[PDB]
Design a protein around this ligand. Structure first.
Ligand SMILES: Cc1cn2c(-c3ccnc(NCC4CC4)n3)c(-c3ccc(F)c(NS(C)(=O)=O)c3)nc2cc1CN(C)C
Ligand SMILES: [Cl-]
Length: 803
């Protein structure tokens, strides 16, 4: 007898298990299910290979007349196709319809669990085919996901795509079209100027040059690489032997998705080469791409003097080998991808002393003096490169990165230099500072109260708070090298450049970011929102008198829907968000009962307050708000975050009239494709609903909806409809129309292309990303640079604090 105690172990989906009975499906069972599924809202887009798979997961069921099938107001789950006899409906126990062999019912449950409207009943002893949501959605998920991964390996095995980046490969993976060929079908004909790459995923095919067999191709063989790059007649006539499955990529779709493939590939090769230099590693992706697009590419025979004693400043080896010489002394051999000329890039006036001589047959990219000048937009290469080095340093900082171009440049031009002896105090703990520093040469030691904190060196920076506040320095900065040089700018110069609204924004933000807050210091003025899941309170900080917003969320509500895993992930997103048009989290708080999120207080209303006051927005007003939302979404998409709930309800306005995005409940860091069905249904993208995979592109659909609301007034899909089902139907199949009072062709163009159902044809979803939206004619007169910088007068300045 051991004296330890051992504790004990522990709706509409229950009734169906009773009726199930395994049944080997006949030929004409599959053809009825093939015809019934093709009439379904979700499955009509699918092909015969996919619908047959959904057919095999269908289950046979057995009933007798007078039985229940599905109650009203229930948890929805099953969808049925009738196989024999007849059934009948009841709406509030009031019979409506009769359904024999062929008819389907309960489709709404496949999309999402909604309350059942009616109740189907059995007239006679009749049977049903059926399937659950969980199974249906997972079948769609794994079919489309395996297709994606299969097509991606095809991309990875074709040599012509080897130099595409990861992101470029995933984008063209979605452009793959699967094409079926019967025995004896010719895939390509000799002499045809084709523009399509093919691969054998499964099967075999025979190669005929001049009507003579050459070989047979097996699952893994591909052909047509050169048809994606050049207009060429096909070398052979390939013909299918057995029933064979080919993954294909057309050039036209590749040019839509990716642009010119040569241009994209060369940019990658050159960008990798240029980034081996410390100089070009601080150039922008646009600048490096411009050097790639404009570089001179030559082929040289062996033993050729490529350079000796023109205006060439940089030289990259694409193929082969060259040998570098200073006068008569070999100094090195450059292989594939290596390069030379740092010295001459930096000093454009310096005489070219070296000579480069080819060792074998080679291909070389040369960057001339004028190639650089064009790239930089300036004949002063030395000054521009230096100007750009400084620019890339400060654009990594919040304070300077959203300033206009002109402001950023003026500021850089105003930088001045000073030198320091080792052991000199550049900054003294306690003194009221007035300067911002960037390290040019050497190193420095950060210290507080004697104890050393860290070391900084070339291109690090310190002291930026002195631009915004008159306050004591919290650390000393001591020189830890012989002759440290710093660039610096005075507060007085900063204040001549930065105008009022942006300064206010920065003043208020860095303060409240950095001041520490414990829960017990918080008085609470009032409630300012109660969205079921949580409660939001305007709160006061006793010591500083800074106001905040505390959002309180009960662990009852969090645990209730199995969101243990999800509230952790939301915290990670919310904490990292550092953008002017996205809400800034300060910190979080734990508890026994409720979680807490402390954020800046936004004191200028909701976006809906603005569009009720303004009505239908003019071009400049819609530009401002959609433009502002675009910048926040772009920001998130660059962090691989998809927002998933874009709608005016989730957009506040600050006291200066600029937007703040809130509510990251539906947001997630994308890891390949997503499938979870999440969002507000009026704003949800077709591809979310169809369950075959989506990414960040869904937020660009929502942009389309938003713009439509702004210009047209009502929503474009399901404006009247309360029924979730009929909203999704209008989204998937409904006609997009525009009222007669919408008079701007460019607005309509943009709205149609944002609301394009298939992501590959959607504006902003190509390789260029948001650039295509930003450069759309709708935005033709709109200054994106002044938007981020708070140099635009917004549509509606909030007079007083409204709640
Ligand atoms: C009106 C409203 C405000 N918030 C906030 C919120 C956030 C900051 N300031 C303010 N001040 C009120 C101004 C007039 C809008 N509210 C917040 C909010 C506060 C703190 C938070 F941590 C969050 N969560 S998060 C970081 O995902 O945006 C959200 N939530 C709401 C909800 C609603 C209700 N609905 C319009 C959606
Ligand atoms: Cl100072």
């Amino acid at each position: 007898r051991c004296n330890e105690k051992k504790k004990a172990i522990f709706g509409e989906d229950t009734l169906m298990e009773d009726h199930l009975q395994l049944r080997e499906k006949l030929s004409e069972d599959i053809e009825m299910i093939k015809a019934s599924l093709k009439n379904n809202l979700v499955c009509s887009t699918l092909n015969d290979n996919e619908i047959l798979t959904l057919s095999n997961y269908m289950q046979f069921f057995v009933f007798k007349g007078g039985d229940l099938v599905i109650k009203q107001g229930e948890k929805g789950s099953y969808f049925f196709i009738i196989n024999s006899g007849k059934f009948d409906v009841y709406v509030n126990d009031k019979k409506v319809k009769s359904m024999g062999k062929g008819s389907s019912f309960g489709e709404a449950a496949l999309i999402h669990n909604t309350q059942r409207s009616a109740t189907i009943m059995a007239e006679t002893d009749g049977t049903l085919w059926g399937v659950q949501r969980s199974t249906f959605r997972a079948t769609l998920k794994q079919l489309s996901n395996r297709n994606f991964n299969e097509n991606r390996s095809f991309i990875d095995s074709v040599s012509v795509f080897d130099m595409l980046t990861e992101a470029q490969k995933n984008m063209i993976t979605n452009a793959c079209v699967i094409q079926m060929f019967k025995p004896g079908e010719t895939i390509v004909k000799q002499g045809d100027y084709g523009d399509v790459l093919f691969i054998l995923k499964e099967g075999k095919a025979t190669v005929f040059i001049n009507d003579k067999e050459i070989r047979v191709l097996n699952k893994g063989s591909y052909f047509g690489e050169r048809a994606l790059l050049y207009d060429e007649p096909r070398s052979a006539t390939i013909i299918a032997k057995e029933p064979t499955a080919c993954a294909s990529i057309c050039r036209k779709l590749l040019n839509i998705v990716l642009g010119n493939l040569q241009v994209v590939l060369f940019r990658n090769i050159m960008t990798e080469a240029l980034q081996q230099s410390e100089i070009f590693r601080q150039f922008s992706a646009e600048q490096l791409n411009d050097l790639a697009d404009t570089a001179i590419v030559r082929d040289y025979p062996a033993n050729y003097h490529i350079l000796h004693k023109k205006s060439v400043k940089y030289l990259i080896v694409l193929e082969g080998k060259v040998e570098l010489f200073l006068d008569d002394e070999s100094i090195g051999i450059l292989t594939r991808g290596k390069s030379f000329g740092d010295q001459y890039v930096l000093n454009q006036k310096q005489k070219f002393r070296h000579t480069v001589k080819s060792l074998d047959v080679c291909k070389i990219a040369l960057i001339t003096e004028s190639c650089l000048a064009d790239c930089l937009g300036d004949n002063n290469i030395d000054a521009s490169i230096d100007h750009n080095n400084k620019k890339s340093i400060i654009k990594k900082m919040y304070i300077f990165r959203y300033l206009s171009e002109q402001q950023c440049n003026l500021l850089i031009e105003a930088f001045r230099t000073t030198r320091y002896e080792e052991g000199d105090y550049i900054i003294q703990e306690g003194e009221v500072g007035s300067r911002f520093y960037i390290i040019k040469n050497g190193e420095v030691e950060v210290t507080k109260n004697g104890k050393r904190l860290r070391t900084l060196g070339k291109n690090d920076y310190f002291g930026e708070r002195a631009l915004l506040y008159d306050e004591p320095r919290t650390a000393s900065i001591i020189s830890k090298a012989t002759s440290v040089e710093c660039w610096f700018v005075d507060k007085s110069v900063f204040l001549q450049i930065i105008q009022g609204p942006m300064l206010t924004h920065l003043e208020e933000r860095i303060k409240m970011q950095d001041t520490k807050v414990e829960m017990h210091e918080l008085e609470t003025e009032r409630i300012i929102g109660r969205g079921t899941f949580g409660t939001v309170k305007l709160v006061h900080h006793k010591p500083t008198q800074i106001r905040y917003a505390l959002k309180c969320v009960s662990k009852r509500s969090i645990i209730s829907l199995n969101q243990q895993n999800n509230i952790k992930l939301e915290r990670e997103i919310t904490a990292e968000n550092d953008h002017p048009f996205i809400i800034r989290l300060v910190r979080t708080f734990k508890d026994s009962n409720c979680f807490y999120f402390l954020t800046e207080l936004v004191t200028g209303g909701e976006l809906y307050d603005a569009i009720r006051k303004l009505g239908l927005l003019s071009k400049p007003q819609a530009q401002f708000y959609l433009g502002s939302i675009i910048l926040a979404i772009e920001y998130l998409h660059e962090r691989n975050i998809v927002y998933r709930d874009l709608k005016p309800e989730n957009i506040l306005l600050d006291k200066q009239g600029y937007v703040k995005l809130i509510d990251f409940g539906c947001a997630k860091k994308i890891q390949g494709r997503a499938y979870t069905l999440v969002g507000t249904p009026h704003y949800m993208a077709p591809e979310v609903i169809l369950g075959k995979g989506y990414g960040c592109t869904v937020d660009i659909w929502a942009l389309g909806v938003c713009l439509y609301e702004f210009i047209c007034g009502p929503l474009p899909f399901g404006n009247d409809q309360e029924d979730q089902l009929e909203i999704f139907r209008d989204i998937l199949t409904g006609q997009l129309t525009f009222p007669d009072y919408v008079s701007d062709q460019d607005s309509i163009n943009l709205m149609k292309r944002l609301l394009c159902r298939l992501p590959q044809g959607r504006i902003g979803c190509s390789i260029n990303g948001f650039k295509d939206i930003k450069e759309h004619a709708f935005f033709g007169n709109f200054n994106w640079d002044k938007l981020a910088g708070r140099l635009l007068e917004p549509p509606l300045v909030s007079k007083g604090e409204t709640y």
